[PDB]
Symmetry: D2
Subunit: 282 residues, 4 copies
């Protein structure tokens, strides 16, 4: 199981560290324009590998991505709009280099804006699975906070953050669930406080790169182990004409299917306004 990360900024290297401490893969290659930085991160992360499951780590050029199952594209560079078209330029340079070396690797895009850059990466790489990290972390926070308030472990909480990664994203309260009940219903049965204030609180919370680092590793593990995990990753969503975060089953071949949630009229509305924002910039 071999993984490459392109761009060893903070996100790339935190993800690489997470992958290593976790034993997610057996080979990990760091690839960056600033070779030296790549060199230094690789060598520092190396002396960390878990005995029970070591990982060859090293830096190299794009040709080293040879046989990567997953490549995590973290490369990136004032209006959101010229962050957008700087990174588009960087992407047009890199993605073809990636496809050249690892034509079959699943491409995991994380640079901001992730949704639009996932769209770009998709067109620059038509014959490859391309996925954006999208709202994965935020969905994870949404669940973590609900579970924290319910007094139960996080695996017992279900909930999605949908749409555009950012202020525009939508919390699908309508589908939020704890121990197999709608959240309101769990809170009531447990005589715990639930209301607009508590939800509003969670809302501000849902919205360092450790969280994203770990998340990127879980998305990667889902692929590496052909896992069919449900993750709200960003992908081209034809109903909306743009790449967006919805829940998607993820495994070795990337996105295996997309299950659009049944939203309230108000949630569905925010979602479409979200999609509009992205349509323009696109």
């Amino acid at each position: 199981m071999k993984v490459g990360v392109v761009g060893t900024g903070f996100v790339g290297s935190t993800a690489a560290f997470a992958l290593v401490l976790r034993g997610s893969c057996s080979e990990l290659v760091l690839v960056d324009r600033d070779e030296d930085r790549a060199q230094a991160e690789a060598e520092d992360i190396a002396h960390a590998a878990p005995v029970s499951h070591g990982t060859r780590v090293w830096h190299g050029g794009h040709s080293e991505l040879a046989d990567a199952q997953v490549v995590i594209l973290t490369a990136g560079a004032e209006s959101r709009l010229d962050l957008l078209e700087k990174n588009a330029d960087i992407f047009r340079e890199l993605v073809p280099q990636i496809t050249r070396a690892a034509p079959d690797a699943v491409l995991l895009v994380t640079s901001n804006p992730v949704d639009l850059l996932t769209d770009l990466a998709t067109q620059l790489a038509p014959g490859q699975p391309v996925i954006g990290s999208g709202t994965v972390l935020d969905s994870a926070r949404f669940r973590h906070l609900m579970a924290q308030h319910a007094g139960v472990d996080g695996t017992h909480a279900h909930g999605y953050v949908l749409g555009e990664h950012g202020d525009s994203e939508v919390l699908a309260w309508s589908s939020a669930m704890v121990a197999g009940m709608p959240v309101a219903d769990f809170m009531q049965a447990q005589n715990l406080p639930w209301n607009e204030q508590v939800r509003a609180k969670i809302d501000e919370g849902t919205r360092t790169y450790y969280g994203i680092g770990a998340a990127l590793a879980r998305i990667t593990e889902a692929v590496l182990r052909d896992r069919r995990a449900v993750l709200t990753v960003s992908a081209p969503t034809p109903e909306y004409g743009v790449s967006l975060s919805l829940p998607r089953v993820v495994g070795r071949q990337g996105v295996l299917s997309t299950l659009h949630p049944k939203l309230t009229g108000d949630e569905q509305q925010k979602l479409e306004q979200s999609a509009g924002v992205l349509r323009g910039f696109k």
Copy 2:
């Protein structure tokens, strides 16, 4: 984090193996009447420890359980098994309470439900829990998830009541990816019907790897105070017996009980299940 397991039959040693392999605890004591088997299983399991986290394994008498956070009690006509097994418990549980009065007692011997009742009275003022239907609930989830084409963590569902032929599958509350299981099958256009459900029901009602691993999960829930929702067996006043329902489990043991909303039929089947146990009790 210290764990003791009493009675080193297959279940106890398989659990211990699971505990050590996952690094669940840093200290593990095997306690058995047959002090040579105990020492063998302890010296053998001792080898299986994972570097990235080691565990000190050894065998001892009941005094060695001192300061254990969890003790797994595996020592063991149904009615014959039961009383024969109750006698053993009346001997052992007090020796356990002697050595570790504030440890969580995890009962796994069959019949687990009634023996959890017995243990609870032999050891008042100490958290007591039976493994109950934990493994069955897990199978139930695993089978739905496998049929849904999704990882098991996205499946929710309980097996309630008596551990055995009488346990109830709470279909009414089976959930996948946030939806009722059928609604999810309808959304993925996967087959869902009585026969699919009856086949899962067979796989849920069935070598001790499944139970060993579950035993470790419950244990880890306590050691790490994780607030895991597990269908473990505890005395349930509404039924006057110890049976399995979903319970939040943490360091102090059962922190609360979540009585699920069942269909008439299920509640009916649960009460009959409780009757059977009152009958032995």
Copy 3:
């Protein structure tokens, strides 16, 4: 990463349990003549996989070994004992080579040494390894470490030769924290004598230990770990398959490291090899 285990007696199933619970592989197949047992143990072990890294577990026929990186051959039923398992091997190994021609083949049946020789014959052009003295070497280390009072990673030592009573403990190279064990024991002012050392030698000479060892060998291959393991392989200097320390990786044994032994240890070794030369 896919592994298939063949023959689901206690060793194979314990090995499978260890692999699953540590997440050693993503994909695991149990294959046995007794397909009912295989199905039972596969369904049970499946229920036992940690959520982080999951493993798809199932049972099947030999054709299911398709694309295994490692196949653990544990099938088994003295000259007679040997002649019965040889027959079984002559039936199975070619089935394995059929479906998984590039799998590393990890032989554990007894006698492991001679059967590793047989399997090597039956499956040329494919890495073949026997579990040999891997577990024994681990106990040897564990027991010294336990007596020295330091974690086991800081003990070094090999059990060489024939798996069994004839196996050789290479005391002459035993090491604790980078020193010869005697020197370590003296520095820490602990007892070291013929009576302590024979009690260790005793604990060195249920299947949890071997299960976990088999997993470790398998993980070495799956991850290409370049681990030094005293596994069994044909050793031309002795004309038989024997346990020596070997660097084990994705392609199996990458090299053999012949240890320096005392004249006495080298003797016990060649005596050990003589026997096997008989079979």
Copy 4:
């Protein structure tokens, strides 16, 4: 198992991240003068927690270290002492039993200081732990084998003045040189000089190393680590190989060095006395 970290600079939060990712402990408190920083990272890190270990992570103040088994102090020496003089007593206040793991530079003297401020409590510094680990990793890499089969210590003062004990360097139970000879791999003053550099040189390695030291404590493992502690045959706090457990340093293993090796060591000892 409870761990707290004082000071959530890079070394602190990378150490905590590593603890949380490996599920090394169940509770983890970040304690910092800058409570806003401590708050997110507790919140961000909240998350890298694997499901099947798993850890409660939060921010708070010194009182919140209560019942900690290990406290990692990551919060120049001149200034850093004034800070220790304020914090260590606050730590000893709340967590009197905790093993005190000092990591700030200079870690050696700042360990001696902390030992002063906190008697009757195990105190150790991270010392040369990371460097001993690089040293071994680089030999192993060159030998073509896994890191566990390499043995080697970096001794003395953390920094430019530390001693690689080439005299006891070992691969697969042999002297590194003897292994490279048997394996037919190049070994020559040049190769070693390269290793030397890499050995003695971003906070991933130190983060992971801090976590491994913490786990040795938390799990009472009896691990041999080259941590810094007051060493009475040098009058200063030094890195030697020491057996480490739940009660901190259980013993000290003074390695047999060449005259030239013991040379640099004793030399550095004095450069320490001030």
